[PDB]
Amino acid sequence: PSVIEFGKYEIHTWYSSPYPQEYSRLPKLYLCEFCLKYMKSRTILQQHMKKCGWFHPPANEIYRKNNISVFEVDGNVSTIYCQNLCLLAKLFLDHKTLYYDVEPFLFYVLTQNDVKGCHLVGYFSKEKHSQQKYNVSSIMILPQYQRKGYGRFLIDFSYLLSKREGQAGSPEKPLSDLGRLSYMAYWKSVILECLYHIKKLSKLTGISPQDITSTLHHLRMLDFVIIRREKLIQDHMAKLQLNLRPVDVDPESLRWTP
Amino acid sequence: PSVIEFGKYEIHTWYSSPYPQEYSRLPKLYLCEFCLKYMKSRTILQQHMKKCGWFHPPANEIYRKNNISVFEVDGNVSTIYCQNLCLLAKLFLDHKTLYYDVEPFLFYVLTQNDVKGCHLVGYFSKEKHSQQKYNVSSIMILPQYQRKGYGRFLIDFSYLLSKREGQAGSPEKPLSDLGRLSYMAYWKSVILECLYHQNDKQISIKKLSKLTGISPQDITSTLHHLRMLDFVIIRREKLIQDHMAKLQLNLRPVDVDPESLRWTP
Ligand SMILES: CN(C)c1ccc2cc(C(=O)NS(=O)(=O)c3ccccc3-c3ccccc3)oc2c1
Ligand SMILES: CN(C)c1ccc2cc(C(=O)NS(=O)(=O)c3ccccc3-c3ccccc3)oc2c1
Ligand SMILES: [Zn+2]
Ligand SMILES: [Zn+2]
User: Which residue from B62, B76, B80 is facing A53, i.e. has the nearest CB?
Assistant: B62
Q: Which of A29, A27, A15 is nearest to A99 (CA)?
A: A15
Sheet holding A9-12, edge to edge: A9-12, A3-6, A28-31, A38-39
Q: Tell me the nearest-neighbour CA distance from A231 into chain B, angstroms.
A: 40
Whole-angstrom distance, CA of residue A45 vs CA of residue A31: 7
Mutual angle of helices A177-196 and A150-164, in 10-degree steps = 60
In chain A, residues with a C-beta closer than 8 Å to the C-beta of B62 are 53
Beta-carbon contacts of B194 under 8 Å, excluding residues fewer than 6 positions away, are B208, B211, B212
Q: Which residue of B has its CA nearest to A34?
A: B60
- Establish whether A172 is a catalytic residue: yes
Q: Which of A160, A152, A154, A67 is nearest to A118 (CA)?
A: A67
Which long-range CB contacts under 8 A does A123-129 form with residues at least 24 apart? A123/A85, A123/A89, A123/A154, A124/A154, A124/A158, A125/A86, A125/A96, A125/A97, A126/A158, A126/A161, A128/A104, A129/A104
User: Which residue from B53, B58, B76 is facing A77, i.e. has the nearest CB?
Assistant: B76
Length of chain A: 258
List, by residue number, the catalytic residues of B.
172
Nearest ligand by distance to the CA of B150: 2
Provide the β-strand partners of residue B97: none
> A105-114 and A60-65: which strand pairing?
unpaired
Beta-carbon contacts of A201 under 8 Å, excluding residues fewer than 6 positions away, are A191, A194, A207, A212
Are A121 and A150 contacting, i.e. CB atoms less than 8 angstroms apart? yes
Rg of chain A in Å (alpha carbons) = 20
* Range B138-171 burial, b when 16+ CB lie within 10 A, else e: bbbbbeebeeeebbbbbbbbbbbbbbeeeebbbb
Whole-angstrom distance, CA of residue B28 vs CA of residue B34: 18
Verify whether the Cβ–Cβ distance A61 to B62 is below 8 Å: no
The residue whose CB lies within 8 Å of the most ligand 2 atoms, and thus the one to mutate among B17, B141, B145, is B141
| Å from CA of B159 to ligand 1 middle | 50
Element (DSSP H or E) covering residue A177: helix A177-196
Are A162 and A27 contacting, i.e. CB atoms less than 8 angstroms apart? no
Whole-angstrom distance, CA of residue B63 vs CA of residue A52: 10
Residue B87: HSE in the Cβ half-sphere, 13 Å Cα cutoff: 20
User: Which residue from A59, A64, A69 is facing B77, i.e. has the nearest CB?
Assistant: A59
Are A13 and A3 contacting, i.e. CB atoms less than 8 angstroms apart? yes
Whole-angstrom distance, CA of residue B230 vs CA of residue B204: 12
Q: Which of A137, A131, A151 is nearest to A90 (CA)?
A: A137
Ranges of beta strands (E only) in chain B are 3-6, 9-12, 28-31, 38-39, 60-65, 68-74, 105-114, 117-127, 134-136, 139-141, 170-171
The reply to whether ligand 2 has any atom less than 6 angstroms from the CB of B140 is yes
End-to-end CA distance of chain A: 39
Mutual angle of helices A177-196 and A209-218, in 10-degree steps = 90
Question: Which residue puts its alpha carbon closest to atom 24 of ligand 2?
Answer: B149
Tell me, in Å, the resolution of the deposited structure.
Answer: 2.7
Are B23 and B1 contacting, i.e. CB atoms less than 8 angstroms apart? yes
User: Which residue from A53, A61, A113 is facing B60, i.e. has the nearest CB?
Assistant: A53
Backbone angles phi, psi at B117, to 5 degrees: 150, -175
Ranges of beta strands (E only) in B32-163 are 38-39, 60-65, 68-74, 105-114, 117-127, 134-136, 139-141
What technique solved it?
A: X-ray
Ranges of beta strands (E only) in chain A are 3-6, 9-12, 28-31, 38-39, 60-65, 68-74, 105-114, 117-127, 134-136, 139-141, 170-171
Question: Which residue puts its alpha carbon closest to atom 18 of ligand 1?
Answer: A182
Backbone angles phi, psi at B210, to 5 degrees: -70, -45
Q: Which amino acid is at A208?
A: S
Are A18 and A79 contacting, i.e. CB atoms less than 8 angstroms apart? no
Nearest ligand by distance to the CA of A30: 3
Give Cα separations from A100 to A33, A76, A103, A134 (angstroms).
Answer: 20, 11, 8, 20
Whole-angstrom distance, CA of residue A33 vs CA of residue A211: 35
The residue whose CB lies within 8 Å of the most ligand 1 atoms, and thus the one to mutate among A96, A147, A186, A248, is A147
Are A45 and A38 contacting, i.e. CB atoms less than 8 angstroms apart? no
Domain ranges of chain B: 3-260
Provide the β-strand partners of residue B111: B69, B120
Are B134 and B158 contacting, i.e. CB atoms less than 8 angstroms apart? no
Are B240 and B203 contacting, i.e. CB atoms less than 8 angstroms apart? no
Whole-angstrom distance, CA of residue A176 vs CA of residue A181: 9
> B28-31 and B3-6: which strand pairing?
parallel
Superfamily of domain B3-260: Gcn5-related N-acetyltransferase (GNAT) (3.40.630.30)
> Is the C-alpha dihedral spanning A51, A57, A59, A64 positive or negative?
negative
SS3 A3: strand
Q: Tell me the nearest-neighbour CA distance from A52 into chain B, angstroms.
A: 7
Q: Tell me the nearest-neighbour CA distance from B262 into chain A, angstroms.
A: 6
Among A34, A36, A60, the residue to mutate for chain B (most B Cβ within 10 A): A60
SS3 A110: strand
The residue whose CB lies within 8 Å of the most ligand 2 atoms, and thus the one to mutate among B152, B175, B184, is B152
SS3 A9: strand
Of A33, A172, A193, A252, which residue is the catalytic one? Answer: A172
Whole-angstrom distance, CA of residue B101 vs CA of residue B90: 15
Whole-angstrom distance, CA of residue A98 vs CA of residue A86: 8
* CA angle (B259 as vertex; B255, B265 as ends), nearest 5: 105
In chain B, residues with a C-beta closer than 8 Å to the C-beta of A54 are 60-61
**Which atom of ligand 2 is nearest the CA belonging to B142?**
1
CATH of the structural domain A3-253, one choice from 3.90.340.10, 2.40.50.140, 3.90.1170.20, 3.40.630.30: 3.40.630.30
Region label for B7, one of left (φ > 0), alpha (ψ between -120 and 50) or beta (otherwise): left
